[PDB]
Amino acid sequence: GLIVLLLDELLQKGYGLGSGISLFIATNICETIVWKAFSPTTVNTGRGMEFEGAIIALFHLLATRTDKVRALREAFYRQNLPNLMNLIATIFVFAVVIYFQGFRVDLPIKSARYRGQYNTYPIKLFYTSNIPIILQSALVSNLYVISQMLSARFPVGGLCHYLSPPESFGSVLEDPVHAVVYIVFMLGSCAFFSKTWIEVSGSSAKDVAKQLKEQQMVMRGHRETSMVHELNRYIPTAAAFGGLCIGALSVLADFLGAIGSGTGILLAVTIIYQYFEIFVKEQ
Amino acid sequence: AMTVYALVVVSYFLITGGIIYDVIVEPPSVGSMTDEHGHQRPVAFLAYRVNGQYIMEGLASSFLFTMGGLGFIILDRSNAPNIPKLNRFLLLFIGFVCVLLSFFMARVFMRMKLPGYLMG
């Protein structure tokens, strides 16, 4: 524990650009896709050892078995192991999420005391990419599934019906209560933790205003401390919607199983995508 | 094109490793018979017969071979020209490639001595 502590705090005041934390999550998520990418072992089922949702698996599978129609069917509709339809959906989610990272609001700025340089301040919707807000959505549902162990004495059944996703590709699986409450909690949790999150880790209305005055950048349209009212009609909604249509987006990470690991993989690669911007910044 | 070179070096350890033992396939490593107490510890590379291998023996051999060759590729492609960062990047390149070269040949020398029992 102390080692992960030291490695994280020597990658905030040290190198630190992404974090220590978020890039650990990102690389371990790269690995959790990657064990699904090439997969050497399979404990043998009723047929077909040593091929579990790899593309090598779905290239060794063409070398073993005849009747290539039922070689296609096991390649594209594999259930218990990872699937390649799963991998298409996984790729698809990556493409859409980088479609939505580029959602940004532009605001041009006359710098103070210099004639007409326009380094337009942007506001991206992902809005720190919600490394708070998803992990806000994750770790409360991790701390109880820690503390259900104290529920064994004094459970994985009746407490689960408002605890977890319903895990079923069948959209009309046997409980709509769990599905509705899970999705509504996901959406509301990320939106609510946006509208509560922005007030602490920067980039709220006064935060942006004092950083821009602090770096001598004034909006053209009006006076310097009306910049607040220039942009206070963006930041909460681009918190809240910026919360909301991530979690529903992770709904599309679960509703369709195109995710190697789900929600978390969408969002740790979102960490990476913001991370590339941070590294590029210093060129 | 150089992609043909990529294809060939891809094929290199692929047919150094186990195309010979695709049809004669011998499963990865377990052969101990309790040795005095503990039953089925997986042993090693095969040692007593020379021509045989397992899957785990062959892949390791192939990996050892192509990293050495592509280390020499890296010596050619960047270390002899003089264009990039002339004190930081270059020194890394000769450093890790010399580490590749020396420790690779050393370990492959070990992995012929111990399966082979050759007088060194």
């Binding site: 080692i3 030291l6 490695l7 020597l10 040290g14 | 040795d35 005095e36 107490h37 503990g38 510890r41």
Partner: peptide, 29 residues
């Protein structure tokens, strides 16, 4: 890390795990 021992410290910790893992397994089989 003004110093690199923190890394070395981590390496020491892995070795302690590495060696101490098989060290008790020495007497077993």
């Amino acid at each position: 890390v003004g110093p690199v021992p923190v890394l070395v410290m981590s390496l020491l910790f892995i070795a302690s795990v590495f060696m101490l893992h098989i060290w008790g397994k020495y007497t077993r089989s």
